[PDB]
Design a binder for this molecule. Structure first.
Ligand code: ADP
Ligand code: BEF
Ligand code: MG
Ligand code: ZN
Ligand code: ZN
Lengths: 98, 132, 119, 411, 185, 67
């Protein structure tokens, strides 16, 4: 109990970093790994990023100076709609990046 | 340099995927328990791996208790039952704890320094795990 | 929590469980009924105890210790808040942290060549 | 008469004053007579000596006011006495206009009697009978000192404001849009100042001798030393030993009002033969009833339940607009570190995408309310908003209090 | 420790058994709230009529089944009048014809159930809107509930009483509970 | 055999008992529908696939790998 202090703040999993390959040969053929590595499909998330930041930049250029402002978004029927749409598109953007 | 994802909140749901469509191959049920992560500031229903749900069963969680999970590793640790259930039992070994403050999904980065031979021994011999 | 018991009454279901254990605890200056959780009454089913028997209860561990029968004369508050101080050399903690088998290793001495990074 | 008169009635105290002066004049709204039967004028209970056994006969009840003649007597005293009101002067008041506040939930017949009386005996040339929440969104019309608290962080009037208003009578929650409050989403809190005084009396009876006969002392102690728990209840309970205050009771012969002796200060070394009632546990317990009514073992839902119900039943588009503007008005909001706790617990209870933003005025919030109604008259909308005598005269008396000043109109 | 082999019977024994030996509350809560909302001692006995009128339950029955725990006078008008006699007195007015004749029945009506209900002037639907509609319906509780000591608010030691079930924490709270707050004793 | 699965339809209730359902498999350049035998029904009972997923099956040993 004195030893189980929070270590996630300063511990590396090292399993998600594919450095435990000594246990990978248990359930993996060589050619399957070879073909699944070459199918590292980039630009599929980037195309979604491209289709999203068009709307993101349009909204920023339209009402990015007041919707993001707390005072204007506090009392405005449609400006908060722009604010929350911008927050949502940014959230999907960085979630797709993750 | 490494980055991970942080999650917290209390537990109410223990249900698999309903899978209303049978498709002719499924007697609809899965070892993927969908839990709405009830944090006071946010809630989301997650399709959870059998390993993370097995660790949930290891903690023997019930309805109404804070949980802590990981996106990548799926590590499950509970601070304890919520203070709402404290009055239910006059005594209980399980500690009654409040919900930690913070958003459901939180992102943290680490730049931890690890020597080469710790990785050497970890690669030569796996360190350990909760599973049998 | 240390005090003489008055009676033990566990509510439950015949086939569905739903265990709700209750038992009055008495001493020289209180007569208090306690609703016991699942773990404590599971233990109380594990070790056979009777009403006149006196037991010691610790909240965190949940273990039960009975020593005598109406033999023991408990007194004072139930919720006695006393510390437990443990001494140890760093050899024991080193052996424990070296290996999950380190417990029996130090209990039997078959340790050896602990990595200096652990030290 | 270009400057109107600003009258803000209250079950406890009525705020009143002209449109010219910054500071409103104060007068308690309650009639008290001693056990011997000697009645004391509402402004003169503070002047009497015997405060042991006092029976209070106020026209206001838990909900509203009923005694029309006694209340009219009170107003006649409070608006015809320039000798005891320096600077103030009002002889008859024909052309003088009125800015009157009232509850959002006035009874039909009681409102009928009130409007009849004010129009026909007080000859108000024009007046505006509206609740405070309507005047609230006009705060942006003027620039002044104003403070704000963030829950997440550790025309000429606004439209989307959420109004929290607490008074001795009761506490209310009001969402306002375009200047017209959303009536169906307005909810009431049963806990008022009288309930607080009664529960302090009961706790003191259970912890000391009987002070149920005493009423002024209970109000004094709840006014001068009661503070909100800064974070929670358990931390204050553990730290209540260091947060211990001792109040010296006022001896009827030498001190009309008592003093709270702080152990941490040495500026009061003189000893007194009068007994001192120590206070260590009830300093934070009373304000905790707002967050946790269950500590008083009462079955009230609570402030958070009321606010979540009001927002959830409110249309979803304006809920973030509501929580984008929260302002506290009334006497009960003067307790320290209170609205910060509200912001924190809203932020805990509100979804992450929303941002909690509550703004707090310094000092008495009832004075800020009087200020906002006073400055509402300067607004160009008031001269359109005011209703004259004739529109009341030719029309039926029910029309004026049902159409323009009627709560059923905006329901 | 636990004995591996233990005595087990069939008739009296059962796996689940382990025994070793040698509406109204809502009314109480509302009444205690409303009496805690009343200051004057003389106003204590009359407000239960208000509670019964608002709740709609019969006054006599709930009064017998529940144990708890004027302002206007011409002479008072006179001394109040002379109190501020520095400046005083507005003017009322009256007229004639059938309209004012009917207004006689409402001017200075002096109507009171205890203070003011006594009328069909308020609609039953309006009455429900006033009283039964403002209060919340479904949100019984969202936040956790905390029960502390009934004497001092202590919470570290939780122990309900054996007679009245009241929660007590310390030895002093127990010893002052039995004779004062333990009515069942 | 490498190919993305389009859909799987097995008559496990109308007829049951490995009704020899048909599954369609697509690739970026070609797409065909493949019959499923009783032993193939049992094989697909393991490594369950709900379609919309790229899997590959060895032609010789008939072992399906879910990529
Ligand atoms: N500085 C203060 N500290 C503590 N309590 C206060 C303070 N100022 C006012 N109060 C409380 O607020 C109540 C006044 O309510 P108020 O808003 O005047 O009612 P009304 O809306 O009828 O005018 C009093 O009962 C008093 O207990
Ligand atoms: F009118 Be009150 F005292 F809030
Ligand atoms: Mg008021
Ligand atoms: Zn106590
Ligand atoms: Zn008792």
């Amino acid at each position: 109990k004195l030893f189980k202090k929070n270590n996630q703040v300063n511990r590396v999993d090292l399993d998600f970093l594919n450095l435990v390959f000594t246990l990978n040969d248990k359930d993996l053929t060589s050619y399957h790994a070879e073909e699944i590595s070459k199918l590292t499909c980039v630009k599929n998330f980037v195309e979604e990023v491209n289709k999203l930041r068009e709307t993101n930049k349009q909204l920023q250029e339209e009402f990015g100076e007041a919707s993001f402002l707390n005072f204007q978004d506090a009392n405005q029927y449609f400006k908060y709609s722009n604010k929350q749409k911008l927050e949502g598109t940014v959230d999907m953007l960085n979630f797709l990046k993750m | 340099k490494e980055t991970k994802e942080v999650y917290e909140g209390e537990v109410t749901e223990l249900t698999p995927e309903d899978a209303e469509n049978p498709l002719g191959g499924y007697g609809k049920t899965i070892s993927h328990v969908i839990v709405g992560l009830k944090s006071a500031k946010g809630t989301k229903t997650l399709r959870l791996d059998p390993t993370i749900y097995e660790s949930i069963q290891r903690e023997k969680v019930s309805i109404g208790d804070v949980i802590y999970i990981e996106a990548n590793t799926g590590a499950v640790k509970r601070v304890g039952r919520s203070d709402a259930y404290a009055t239910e039992f006059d005594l209980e070994t399980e500690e009654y704890v409040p919900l930690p403050k913070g958003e459901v999904h939180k992102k943290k980065e680490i730049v931890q320094d690890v020597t080469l031979h710790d990785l050497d021994v970890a690669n030569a011999r796996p360190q350990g795990g909760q599973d049998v | 929590i240390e005090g003489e018991v008055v009676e033990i009454q566990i509510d439950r279901s015949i086939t569905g469980g739903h265990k709700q254990g209750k038992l009055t605890i008495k001493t020289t200056d209180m007569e208090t009924i306690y609703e016991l959780g699942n773990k404590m009454i599971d233990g109380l089913t594990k070790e056979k105890v009777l009403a006149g028997d006196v037991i010691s209860i610790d909240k965190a561990s949940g273990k039960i210790t009975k020593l005598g029968r109406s033999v023991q004369c408990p007194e004072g508050e139930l919720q006695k808040r006393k510390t437990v101080v443990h001494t140890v050399s760093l050899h024991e903690i080193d052996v424990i942290n070296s290996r999950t088998q380190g417990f029996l290793a130090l209990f039997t001495g078959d340790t050896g060549e602990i990595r200096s990074e652990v030290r | 008469e270009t400057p109107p008169i600003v009258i803000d009635n209250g079950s406890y105290e009525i705020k009143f004053g002209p449109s010219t002066n910054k500071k409103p004049f104060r007068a308690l709204n309650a009639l008290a007579k001693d056990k011997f039967g000697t009645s004391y004028l509402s402004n003169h209970i503070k002047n009497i000596k015997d405060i042991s056994s006092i029976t209070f006969r106020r026209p206001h009840e838990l909900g509203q006011l009923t005694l029309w003649e006694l209340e009219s007597c009170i107003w006649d005293y409070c608006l015809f006495n320039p000798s005891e009101f320096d600077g103030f002067d009002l002889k008859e008041g024909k052309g003088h206009h009125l800015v009157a506040s009232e509850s959002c939930m006035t009874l039909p017949e009681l409102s009928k009697h009130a409007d009849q009386v004010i129009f026909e005996e007080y000859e108000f040339d024009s007046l505006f009978k509206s609740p405070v929440a309507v005047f609230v969104p006009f705060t942006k019309s003027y620039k002044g000192e104003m403070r704000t608290i963030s829950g997440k962080d550790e025309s000429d009037y606004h439209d989307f404001q959420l109004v929290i208003d607490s008074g001795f009578n009761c506490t209310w929650i009001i969402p306002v849009l375009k200047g017209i409050p959303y009536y169906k989403a307005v909810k009431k809190l049963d806990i008022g100042g009288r309930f607080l005084t009664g529960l302090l009396k009961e706790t003191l009876s259970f912890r000391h001798y009987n002070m149920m006969d005493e009423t002024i002392l209970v109000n004094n102690i709840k006014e001068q030393c009661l503070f909100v728990s800064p974070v929670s209840y358990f931390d204050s309970f553990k730290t209540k030993d260091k947060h211990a205050l001792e109040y010296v009771l006022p001896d009827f012969q030498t001190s009309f009002l008592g003093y709270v002796r702080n152990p941490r200060k040495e500026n009061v070394p003189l000893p007194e033969d009068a007994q001192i009632i120590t206070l260590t546990d009830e300093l934070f317990t009373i304000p905790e009833t707002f967050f946790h009514p269950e500590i008083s073992q009462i079955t009230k839902p609570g402030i958070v339940e009321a606010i979540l119900e009001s927002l959830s039943m409110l249309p979803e588009i304006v809920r973030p607009l509501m929580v984008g503007n929260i302002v506290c008005t009334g006497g009960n909001f003067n307790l320290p570190n209170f609205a910060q706790r509200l912001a924190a617990e809203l932020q805990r209870q509100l979804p992450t995408d929303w941002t909690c933003h509550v703004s707090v005025p310094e000092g008495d919030c009832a004075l800020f309310g009087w200020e906002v109604m006073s400055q509402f008259a300067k607004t160009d909308s008031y001269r359109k908003a005011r209703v004259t005598r004739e529109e009341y005269y030719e029309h039926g008396p029910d029309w004026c209090t049902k159409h323009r000043f009627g709560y059923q109109n905006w329901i | 420790m636990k004995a591996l082999v233990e005595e087990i019977d069939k008739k009296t024994y059962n796996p689940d058994i382990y025994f070793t030996s040698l509406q109204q509350e809502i009314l109480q809560s509302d009444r205690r709230f409303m009496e805690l909302n009343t200051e004057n001692f003389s106003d204590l006995p009359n407000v239960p009529t208000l509670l019964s009128d608002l709740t709609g339950v019969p006054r006599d029955r709930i009064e017998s089944t529940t144990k708890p725990i004027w302002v206007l006078k011409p002479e008072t008008l006179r001394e109040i009048q002379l109190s501020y006699k520095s400046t005083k007195l507005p003017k009322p007015k009256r007229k004639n014809t059938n309209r004012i004749v009917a207004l006689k029945k409402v001017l200075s009506s002096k109507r009171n159930l205890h203070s003011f209900l006594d009328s069909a002037l308020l609609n039953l639907m309006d009455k429900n809107v006033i009283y039964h509609n403002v209060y919340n319906k479904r949100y019984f509780k969202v936040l956790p509930l905390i029960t502390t000591c009934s004497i001092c608010g202590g919470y570290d030691s939780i122990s309900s009483c054996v007679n009245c079930g009241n929660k007590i924490c310390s030895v002093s709270c127990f010893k002052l509970h039995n004779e004062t707050r333990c009515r069942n004793r």
